Design a protein around this ligand. Structure first.
Ligand SMILES: O=C1[C@@H](P(=O)(O)O)CCCN1O
Ligand SMILES: O=C1[C@@H](P(=O)(O)O)CCCN1O
Ligand SMILES: [Mg+2]
Ligand SMILES: [Mg+2]
Lengths: 436, 434
């Protein structure tokens, strides 16, 4: 026996919505994990199991998922007698048990919750820190501290402004270490808060779901101006660069794109994919933008491929690839992008998430580990990004502790790794060139 | 020993400012604690030691405090040979080593960090959950789940609007359990978000430091109406009441009070304590307000006693008592208030915090364990409020996980208790009667 007990419960995430937490018990103690939740429901994503009872948490309860774990998944894994270190064997077993493709029987959140807890238990059984255990599961040996991407200006579907593009991020690529990167990010963030307060009023510095600011802006170029201004005023002009999550699937209108989709529908203002690309070109020219995520729709494959082949920055697939090995294989084929955004709950398990990572890295892609808009105090993805030697992660602004928890864990990891610890820096896309 | 190692480091809190985190190693494993931080410091509070080095974090660093732990405190507590179950001996040793009034040598954040990690290590040494270890340190045998107080509407010095009073909270007193209490709170919070969106716009649903909303309103009575509208539309009119943190020190002007202090200084709209008291009287009448925190300035003792002696609701001292035993007994003698807000970082140690609580409880006060505006992923106060059996805790909205982590932990505790689990309910002021 390795697994003594697997027990799941219902906790609240950063937004106040129910989510899955799983406690796994072995002889070496308690191992706890919680599942993040996206804002929108992707059609290619593995199914997030919700109760749908409108009188309880407005239908967002996860009692059915919890029960699947406690009544079905838990006794089955204990029956198998498989060690907690057999991550692949245990993950696979849950998949056959679920039988479906998108994990619709047990739910991806139920399967991931157990998967994450197993990985933590297995790490103690190997007597390795979590990031080291993940490293061996992936086939890595030379660890890397990632460049953090702090979203500081927010737009898109769930922002109060008119700003169409979702996230504007800062990347301290010129930092001495990760701890140094945290300082740079925080200082620019508080500098930005002052710039926004002076230009938009004191009632414009409240934060969104991920700790970023959402002042009333329409022009995407204007959002970049604020960010660059804050960077320069903080005194880090070329030690910090800019990243973007456009989330273009959110304003995809009949084959075109609406950069004012939160205004009354006027189909005349729509622009083509080529037009949207030329806009990006201007941004790269006028601003230190080094990475753009979801620049086009999740099914606009022609636009992705055409853009990637003609720009030298990082193109990140999110809604396009949804951490799905099948979608990734197609994206490699068509050269749609050159970076995979890794969301573990999109695919539903640790084993499959590692496979998706290796699939991208072996084809010359970069990877970027990512949070969800609904997060918990769980810090698994901090150990994940290091173990996978990814070199880049976005897990929120330096505000709200569902974000800081990840960043704090990474600072502890850098401390623990000592002289072996290497910061990705300007090599966040391709950290392998530093490994020595 | 029994402590093998104490290593402190610099982490970031919920606002992105540096704070102290402490790792304490015993033979039974690693024990970790982090220190919260308020928006401002008073004259009676224990000193929070910052670096003031404008080369780093705009002077907000805590490398001095970390160094004081790693270089001075850590080798001393290890040298003592004291076991981790000896909370008081280890705390007193840090008190005399600091040897100052307000812990101004090492810093309160330095001393508390070790103190909290010691307490966690002590719980495991006696093979108990943390809240049970605290219960034995406090001299309690009972264990009850507190009523949570979620702030949902925010004003005061650090809110963007024009709202004078600082916090407006909802208290699910009529819930079946704490898990049910979380569900009621989250449903009203989400209901409120829709209410605010409809009346004040899409751009008004962004949150402040503790997760509460800050819509552009002026009238304090308007904040109460929004809350009540949310409670009723969610269908919990009978089960949810309202609490308030006024923080009146922030608009204390010329011996008067300014309910529009965030607007250019006008001495015309100033009102007296008697005038302010009457406004509270009307609030309590027209709305289910059962508790008010800091109704008057931290040194307007006349207004406090006069108002407390003329109401039945709960009166909570925050700026007034700052978890300071000396100020607490003065508040008792003058009967300034009937409830103590408990902020562990204001006094600086676990032992002194437990003592300040018992001092309040023995004089017939209620106690409300509280978060700071700057918090971390640490969940110590969740176990603290249970072990002290105070019946009431405020640690933010059901939003932002530096708040949820406490609420989640409280739910885990209730589950771990099972049958012995009792919800304070309508007895949140005196859970002693249960
Ligand atoms: O696209 C997104 C959204 P969601 O978590 O809602 O998918 C915000 C969080 C990260 N990300 O890349
Ligand atoms: O008065 C307050 C403030 P701070 O912790 O900033 O004093 C907000 C948090 C709790 N409280 O009672
Ligand atoms: Mg995205
Ligand atoms: Mg207060």
């Amino acid at each position: 026996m390795s697994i003594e007990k697997i027990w799941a419960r219902e906790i609240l995430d950063s937004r106040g919505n129910p989510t899955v937490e799983v406690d796994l018990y072995t002889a070496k103690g308690l191992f706890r994990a919680a599942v993040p939740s996206g804002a929108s429901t992707g059609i290619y994503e593995a199914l997030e199991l919700r109760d749908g009872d409108k009188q309880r948490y407005l239908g967002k309860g996860v009692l059915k998922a919890v029960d699947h774990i406690n009544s079905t998944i838990a006794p089955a894994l204990i029956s198998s007698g498989l060690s907690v270190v057999e991550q692949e064997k245990l993950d696979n077993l849950m998949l056959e048990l679920d039988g479906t493709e998108n994990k619709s029987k047990f739910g991806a959140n139920a399967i991931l919750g157990v998967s994450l807890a197993v990985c933590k238990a297995g790490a103690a059984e190997r007597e390795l820190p979590l990031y080291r255990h993940i490293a061996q599961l992936a086939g890595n040996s030379d660890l890397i501290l990632p460049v953090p991407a702090f979203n500081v200006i927010n737009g898109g579907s769930h922002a109060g402004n008119k700003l169409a593009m979702q996230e504007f991020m800062i990347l301290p690529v010129g930092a001495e270490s990760f701890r140094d990167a945290m300082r740079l990010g925080a200082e620019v963030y508080h500098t930005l808060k002052g710039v926004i307060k002076d230009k938009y009023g004191k009632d414009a510095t409240n934060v969104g779901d991920e700790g970023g600011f959402a002042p009333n802006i329409l022009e995407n170029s204007e959002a970049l101006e604020l960010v660059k201004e804050a960077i320069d005023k903080a005194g880090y002009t070329e030690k910090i660069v800019i990243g973007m999550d456009v989330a273009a699937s959110e304003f995809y209108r009949d084959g075109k794109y609406d950069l004012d989709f939160k205004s009354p529908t006027d189909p005349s203002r729509y622009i083509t994919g080529d037009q949207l690309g030329a806009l990006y070109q201007d941004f790269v020219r006028d601003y230190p933008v080094v990475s753009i995520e979801d620049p086009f729709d999740q099914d606009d494959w022609a636009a992705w491929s055409k853009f990637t082949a003609n720009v030298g920055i990082q193109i990140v697939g999110d809604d396009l690839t949804v951490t799905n090995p099948k979608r990734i294989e197609r994206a490699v084929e068509e050269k749609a992008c050159n970076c995979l955004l890794l969301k573990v709950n999109q695919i539903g398990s640790v084993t499959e998430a590692i496979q998706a990572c290796k699939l991208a890295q072996e084809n010359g892609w970069g990877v970027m580990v990512s949070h969800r808009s609904g997060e918990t105090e769980d810090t698994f993805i901090a150990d994940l990004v290091v173990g996978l030697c990814t070199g880049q992660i976005k897990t929120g602004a330096p505000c709200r502790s569902e974000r800081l928890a990840k960043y704090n864990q990474l600072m502890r990891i850098e401390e623990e790794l000592g002289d072996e610890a290497r910061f990705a820096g300007h090599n966040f896309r391709n950290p392998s060139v530093l490994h020595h």
